Design a protein around this ligand. Structure first.
Ligand code: HEM
Ligand code: HEM
Ligand code: HEM
Ligand code: HEM
Lengths: 146, 141, 141, 146
């Protein structure tokens, strides 16, 4: 991503207040509840039957932590997302064969979550900025789909 | 699908919005403009800057509609015919932009309903909005 | 939004389809697996080779289901219930894929029904298929 | 895109049988009929009132030529599609603001149109090869969105 330095600041500054142990889950979990065809990728996590089934699942929460990990990771290297997500595009496009529009989805729920956590602190402009971070990531993971 | 369950939270949350509706539609618009500028292409006769009365007024119009839609959550088709014609035949809005404005709707809802934005509610507000979009673009069928 | 004009056209094309329905249906799959490999992913237990009697066998099923929809064209949601369930809940197909399969059916319908395959008709089928799909995924939204 | 030789060949082969003055307009035409919101871009063209109207508009036929042409430089430059389509990308993204999904749509119909003319010849494997190209092409036009 590009990101003007005021976006740069903004974004960055936001992330620093994010409880990774917890936002990572909100996100992944909500994706599994909102876009339920996504579940098929996680048969293994067990019961995903319900919002509650989904939210209390540790496996899920555990995994959500891994995802925001890559998020900060990527976030840190906006200049060169491709390098950061190399292995990612692979696992995802190559091994899992996940449709890329889904990656798009994960980003928006992440956005929705931030909004949920920060409320008014999450301004349109800020939202705009992350929206760029998100697409940027999404694209990177698709790459190995060419 | 707007299962009964769905119709509920929706009414719950929307009701929860009440008089703030107009301000939020406005936010939601503003949000879209900034985040997806391709969308500004459709409101050339508007001043789209942050102040924007023009946008505020439009926010109210859209907020108002989502309302009558919540109201007739059952029969939105007869409820939105007027809008559908306008968007599909008159403006030829590209369907995709509905997905956009809806995301910004969700994102406006979330920010003002901290206690209220649950994974379940989130999901129900997502389907309501999607449905509306559908009606909104059904003339392309 | 399957106007009569629409239903008619659908009817005719499928009409002209007749018995070939099975092989046509088979045709679209193979076309699909070939043009969008990613979808093979749902057919592990399958022989997805150039002449699979499975693929032959499934093609018929799909077509049969298509015919049936055609027939209860204004009661799809009902004529398709079972299938909707299998597709959403049990198989959980990425909705995205329906767009692929339907593009493949068209392409097939065109290469077999040149004389019928006209603008107006192309538009009608697309809408048809659009609906069938919509219905097949109603179990999500 | 990639293609095999025998892939790259048969595309090239069939493309040879293509009546240029026609195909472009059939394609562009059918797009404005099947996905009517696309008309917004082509308002100046005249009467798009009906299929026949659209199917017969001369601004429509003429522009179609221009379009099929681009597919042609593209066919000759399967690797450098990116570079090939770069000026068009600006035009399309930056100045026109067409949504990228619209390129997939256009290519998809070019395929129905090819199927339409070539019947049995337009075999699955031919479509598959052709599918690649259309995608490569779509991407390439969407670049400045990335
Ligand atoms: C959108 C941004 C995404 C990021 C940053 C991300 C990140 C990750 C990470 C870090 C792993 C595990 C890698 C390891 O530790 O070896 C993983 C695995 C996985 N991801 Fe994602 N993911 C994303 C999107 C998605 C989406 C949309 C889906 C499906 C809907 C998905 C499905 C999976 C699955 C099924 C695994 C399983 C790997 C395992 O079980 O070890 N991912 N992802
Ligand atoms: C939930 C989705 C939407 C709702 C509920 C909605 C509702 C409305 C309403 C109530 C109006 C005013 C009607 C009147 O003049 O009486 C309107 C007009 C308009 N809409 Fe939408 N709309 C939606 C989606 C969109 C999208 C996605 C776009 C594309 C950016 C869009 C672009 C416009 C434009 C350009 C106008 C014209 C305003 C004017 O004439 O000054 N709408 N819409
Ligand atoms: C026009 C839309 C579609 C129709 C009419 C349709 C119809 C059917 C029918 C009739 C069956 C089997 C019923 C039985 O076993 O009695 C089936 C199964 C299946 N469908 Fe579809 N389908 C459609 C779309 C899709 C799409 C887009 C996919 C994604 C790849 C898909 C994947 C499958 C799979 C994997 C199976 C079951 C294979 C098995 O028996 O193990 N379907 N479908
Ligand atoms: C899909 C692949 C496409 C190709 C290869 C293509 C090619 C072209 C070409 C060659 C031009 C004219 C530039 C010149 O004068 O040299 C053009 C212009 C244009 N294109 Fe496309 N196009 C594509 C898709 C689309 C789509 C999907 C839309 C909108 C639905 C679109 C809308 C336009 C419009 C409205 C113009 C008018 C240019 C002007 O006269 O200002 N194009 N395109």
């Amino acid at each position: 991503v590009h990101l003007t330095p005021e976006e740069k600041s903004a974004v960055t500054a936001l992330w620093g207040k994010v409880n990774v142990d917890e936002v990572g889950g909100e996100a992944l979990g909500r994706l599994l509840v909102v876009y339920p065809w996504t579940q098929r990728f996680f048969e293994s996590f067990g019961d995903l039957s319900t919002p509650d089934a989904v939210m209390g699942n540790p496996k899920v929460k555990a995994h959500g932590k891994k995802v925001l990990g890559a998020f900060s990771d990527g976030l840190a290297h906006l200049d060169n997302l491709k390098g950061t997500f190399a292995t990612l595009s692979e696992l995802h496009c190559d091994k899992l064969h996940v449709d890329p529009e889904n990656f798009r989805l994960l980003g928006n729920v992440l956005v929705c979550v931030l909004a949920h956590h920060f409320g008014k602190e999450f301004t349109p402009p800020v939202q705009a900025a992350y929206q760029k971070v998100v697409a940027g990531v999404a694209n990177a993971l698709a790459h190995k789909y060419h | 699908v707007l299962s009964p369950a769905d119709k509920t939270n929706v009414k719950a949350a929307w009701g929860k919005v009440g008089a703030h509706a107009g301000e939020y539609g406005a936010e939601a618009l503003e949000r879209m403009f900034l985040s997806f500028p391709t969308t500004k292409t459709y409101f050339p006769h508007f001043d789209l800057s942050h102040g924007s009365a023009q946008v505020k007024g439009h926010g109210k119009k859209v907020a108002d509609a989502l309302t009558n839609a919540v109201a007739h959550v059952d029969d939105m088709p007869n409820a939105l015919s007027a809008l559908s014609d306008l968007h599909a035949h008159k403006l030829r809005v590209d369907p995709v932009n509905f997905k956009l404005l809806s995301h910004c709707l969700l994102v406006t809802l979330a920010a003002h309903l901290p206690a209220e934005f649950t994974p379940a509610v989130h999901a129900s507000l997502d389907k309501f909005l999607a449905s509306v979009s559908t009606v909104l673009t059904s003339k392309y069928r």
